[PDB]
Design a protein around this ligand. Structure first.
Ligand code: FAD
Ligand code: FAD
Lengths: 450, 450
C-alpha cells in the first residue's frame, strides 16, 4: 500500500510505541513500521522448551516513574524478585562467602575504599545529571579519561575498583572499563537516580511485570490496530523540509509530515536517506556501539537454592559469570536463575562450542549455588548480538570521548527526522523507562511543532 | 665385597661427602655408598642437546660462609649472575612494568604493606632463629597457623600478601602457603640470615660456581677414591649399640661403628632397619615431604634481553612462571634463562603434554621478556620428582604443625645411626651450604663420641 499519516514511526520497540501512543492521544495519525514478525524489540517473552522466559528486558525499579505510570495505564501489575536469605560473594582470590547486608564481605580496607568510591560517584552524579552531562564544566576532564584510569587515580585498592566496575561496566554499559570514560559512568549512575541505586540489586532489579515486560509493547500495539506494520524493514527515507516518504519491504510507502527513527543508533545507517543526513550525523552515528552480554536462563525442578537459605543473588567480579539472581516466574513452582556474562568474557564464551560454553557457565553458577546448578531442566542463552535488528545488548553508548564531543547533538531533529530510543535517553538511559520517556518527549516535540 | 670402616655414609650428595671429608681429616675411615651412577645428589651438571646446564642446585649467597670456605678449600672459583639493566614486574592484574630498585613498582598502599610485612618477618627471624625455632615461646602460636592465615591476619592487601608468599612459598619451600605454618616461614627466613635476604635476588641468587656446583661433590669424592661406591642403593641397616652393618646392591657389606644417613628425610624408609627405628622416628619421618618446582632452562643464540636494556630478572606472583633470571654460563656467548614453576602450578603443568607444557611456559616467559623467549635453541625442564632417589625439589619440610611437634628430634642420633642432609639444617636450611654444615656437624659429633 501507500498511506498518508502525520508521523511515520520506524521500529515498534517500546520507545516507538510510546511515541505512537502519545501522538494518537493528541489527535495525530501514525503508522508504525516494524521489521520483525513481532513488536517489543529488545523486550521479548517466549516459551523455550516449555519454560516461559523474558529473553530481553524485564526489570522495573522505583526511579522508573514513567514506565510505572505506563504499566498502570495499561492495566499491568508487577511482582518483586525473591530476596530472602543470604547472598553469595566470590572474592578476587576465588573465595566464596555467604552474607547479608549492604556491603560485600571483603577485608575492611576494601570495604572502606568501596564506600568512599560509591560516595564520590553519588556526588558526581548529583552534580552532573543525566539530561546534559556534556554541559557540566567537569565534562571534558571526565570524558577524556577511561573509567579504569579514573578509578586507578582515585584508589589503590584493586578489589574495590573491580567491584565498582562490576556495577557499571559488566552490570550496565556491558563494555570493559578501559573502553568508556568516567563521564559515561557518571551519566549511567545519574540516569538511575544515583550510583548507590546501581549497587543495590533490591533497587535496580526490584520488580518484574506479571505477564512479562513484552506485554507493555504488545498492549500499546493492540490499541493501534492496522497502523502497525510487521515484517516490514524500512529501507529508505526520502525527505525535505515539508515531510518524508518512508519505504519498507512488502512495497509499503508512508507519506508523512515527520519521521521518528525509534531504533538504537548503531542501526541508523541501515536506512538510505535521500538526501543524505548532514556530516554531523554521519560522523556522530559512527561513534555509537551497543555492548554485549549473555543473559543466561536456567530452569530447575524447584528453586533449590532457597532450601539452602540463599536468595539466589551472587556477585563475583573475577568469575566468568559476574552476577546471578533468582528469576523464578510469578506463581511458578519451578525455580529459574538468570545470570550475566559481560563484554570481553561474553566474547570469550562465544569462542567455545555451545556445549563447552554451557558447561563453563554452569560450572561458574555451581561456584555460587552448588552442584545442583549444573543439572537444569531447561538451559537457554539470550543471543541479541546475532539479531540483525538489534546486534548487541543491553544498549548503545559512545566510544571513549564521544559523549562530550557529540552528546549535545544526539537528540536533535534533522528537519522532519526525529530520534527516539533508550540509548539516547536521560533518566532511564538504556532501559525500557528511558525508551518510554524518549518516546513521550519526541511526541510532545512533534505536537508542539504542529 | 665386605669391608670394615669407622663410619658408613649412605648417600654421596654434598652433605654425605662433607661428612666423609671431615671424618678423614680427623683420621677416621669411611665408605660412602651411593645409589646413582654419580655423586652430587640434588646438584648435577650435564650437557643437554649441546648446552651445559646445572640441573640442580647452583647458587651461592654471601651468608653461605661454610660453602664459601669449602669452595676455597677445593680450589673452586665463583662468578656473579648478570644484573645490569631493568627488571620486569607482572602485577596481580597482569600488567607488566619494567623497573629498578629494591621495591616492586606497585601502587603505594601495596608498597607500604610489603615493607611492613618484610620488617615484621625480619624481626621474627632475628628473635626466633634457625637453630631451634621450636624452642621459642612463640613457637606453638606460629606453628599452628598456616602462613596464608598469618598473612591475612597481618594485612588486608592481597597483592603484598601474594608477593610476600612469592619469596617463601614458590620461592623457597616450594609448597603452597596454606600448607605450611608461619613458624616454617620464619625458619626459612632466619636460615638465610633475614627475610630481606630472601627478597633481594642480588643476595640470595648472587653467584654461581665456575665449573658448576656439582664439582663441589665431584672433588670431595675424588679425594676419597675407592671408598666411594656408586650404583650401590643401600637396602638394609642392621644395628645395635656397638655398630652397624650396611648392605647395598652389588653384594656390598660395610661393617662400621656409626652410620650417617645423608639422604633427604622422605627417603629414610626406603632402607630396612633391623631392629626397626623407634616409634618417634617412625612417626616423625612420615610428616616430612619435599616440595615440587620445575627448573626451566632455555638457551638462545644471544642473551637477547640485554639488547632491550633488561637484566633478565622477572617476578610475577600471578603468572604460571613466577620467577625468571639470566642464567648465562660463565664465558658463554649464548644466553641462557632459568625460570621456576612452583607447587600446585608445577602439578598443573605436569598434567599437560610435554609440548603443551613447553608452549605454556614459553608464553609466560614471553610476557616478561618478549616474543623471542618463545624461540629457544635448547629447552629443558629439570624433573627431580621422577627421580626415585630424590622425588621432589628443592628440599623437604614438615607438614603444617610438624615443625614444633617434631623439630627438636630431627637431628638426634638413634644409637649408632646419625642423620645429615640440608633438609634438617639450621643456617643454610634446604641449600648446599646447609648440607655442608650438617655434614660437618655430624662428623664433629661422631669424632667427639670417638
Ligand atoms: C538481554 C537484555 C536485558 C535487558 N534487561 C533490561 C531490564 O531488565 N530493565 C530495563 O529497563 N531494560 C532492560 N533492557 C533494555 C531494554 O530492553 C531496551 O532499552 C529497550 O527495549 C529499548 O527500547 P527502544 O524502543 O529504545 O529500542 P528496541 O527495543 O531495540 O526497539 C527497536 C525496534 O526497531 C526495530 N527496527 C530496527 N531497525 C529497523 C528498520 N530499519 N526498519 C523497521 N524496524 C526496525 C527493531 O526490530 C525493534 O523492534 C535489556 C536489554 C537486553 C538486550
Ligand atoms: C632444582 C633444584 C635447584 C636447587 N637450587 C639450589 C640453589 O640454587 N642453591 C642451593 O644452595 N641449593 C639449591 N638446591 C638444593 C641443594 O641442591 C640440596 O639442598 C642439596 O643438594 C642437598 O644435599 P644433601 O647432601 O643434603 O642431599 P642430596 O643432594 O639429595 O644427596 C642425597 C644422596 O643420597 C642418595 N641416596 C638416597 N637414598 C639412598 C639409598 N638408600 N642408598 C644410597 N644412596 C641414597 C641420593 O642418590 C643422593 O646422591 C636445589 C635443588 C633442586 C632440586
Amino acid at each position: 500500500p501507500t498511506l498518508q499519516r502525520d508521523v511515520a514511526i520506524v521500529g515498534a520497540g517500546p520507545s516507538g510505541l510510546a511515541a505512537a501512543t502519545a501522538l494518537r492521544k493528541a489527535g495525530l495519525s501514525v503508522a508504525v513500521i516494524e521489521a520483525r514478525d513481532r513488536v517489543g524489540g529488545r523486550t521479548w517473552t517466549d516459551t523455550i522448551d516449555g519454560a516461559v522466559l523474558e529473553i530481553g528486558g524485564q526489570w522495573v525499579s522505583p526511579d522508573q516513574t514513567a514506565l510505572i505510570s505506563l504499566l498502570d495505564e495499561l492495566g499491568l501489575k508487577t511482582f518483586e524478585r525473591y530476596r530472602e536469605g543470604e547472598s553469595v560473594y566470590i572474592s578476587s582470590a576465588g573465595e566464596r562467602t555467604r552474607y547479608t547486608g549492604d556491603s560485600f564481605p571483603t577485608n575492611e580496607t576494601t570495604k572502606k575504599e568501596m564506600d568512599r568510591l560509591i560516595d564520590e560517584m553519588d556526588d558526581l552524579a548529583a552534580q552532573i545529571g543525566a539530561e546534559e552531562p556534556w554541559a557540566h564544566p567537569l565534562a571534558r576532564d571526565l570524558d577524556t579519561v577511561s573509567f579504569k584510569q579514573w578509578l586507578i587515580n582515585q584508589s589503590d585498592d584493586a578489589e574495590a575498583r573491580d567491584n565498582i566496575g562490576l556495577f557499571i561496566a559488566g552490570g550496565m554499559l556491558t563494555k570493559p572499563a578501559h573502553s568508556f570514560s568516567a563521564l559515561q559512568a557518571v551519566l549511567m549512575a545519574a540516569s538511575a537516580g544515583s550510583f548507590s541505586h546501581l549497587v543495590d540489586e533490591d533497587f535496580i532489579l526490584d520488580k518484574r511485570v506479571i505477564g512479562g515486560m513484552q506485554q507493555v509493547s504488545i498492549r500499546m500495539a493492540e490499541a493501534l490496530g492496522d497502523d502497525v506494520f510487521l515484517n516490514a524493514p524500512v529501507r529508505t527515507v526520502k525527505w525535505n523540509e515539508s515531510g518524508a516518504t518512508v519505504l519498507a519491504d512488502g512495497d509499503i510507502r508512508v507519506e508523512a509530515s515527520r519521521v521518528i527513527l525509534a531504533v538504537p543508533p548503531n542501526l541508523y545507517s541501515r536506512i538510505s536517506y535521500d538526501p543524505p543526513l548532514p556530516r554531523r550525523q554521519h560522523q556522530m552515528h559512527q561513534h555509537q556501539s551497543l555492548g554485549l552480554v549473555i543473559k543466561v536462563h536456567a530452569v530447575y525442578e524447584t528453586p533449590f537454592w532457597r532450601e539452602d537459605g540463599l536468595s539466589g543473588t551472587g556477585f563475583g567480579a573475577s568469575e566468568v559469570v559476574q552476577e546471578v539472581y533468582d528469576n523464578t516466574n510469578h506463581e511458578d513452582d519451578r525455580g529459574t536463575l538468570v545470570a550475566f556474562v559481560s563484554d570481553e568474557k561474553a566474547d570469550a564464551m562465544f569462542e567455545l562450542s555451545a556445549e563447552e560454553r554451557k558447561a563453563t557457565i554452569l560450572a561458574s553458577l555451581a561456584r555460587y549455588l552448588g552442584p545442583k546448578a549444573e543439572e537444569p531442566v531447561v538451559y537457554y542463552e539470550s543471543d541479541w548480538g546475532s539479531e540483525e535488528w538489534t546486534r548487541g545488548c543491553y544498549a548503545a553508548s559512545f566510544d571513549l570521548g564521544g559523549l562530550h564531543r557529540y552528546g549535545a547533538d544526539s537528540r536533535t531533529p534533522v528537519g522532519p527526522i526525529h530520534f527516539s530510543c533508550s540509548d539516547i535517553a536521560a533518566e532511564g538511559y538504556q532501559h525500557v523507562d528511558g525508551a518510554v520517556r524518549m518516546g513521550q518527549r519526541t511526541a510532545a516535540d512533534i505536537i508542539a511543532r504542529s
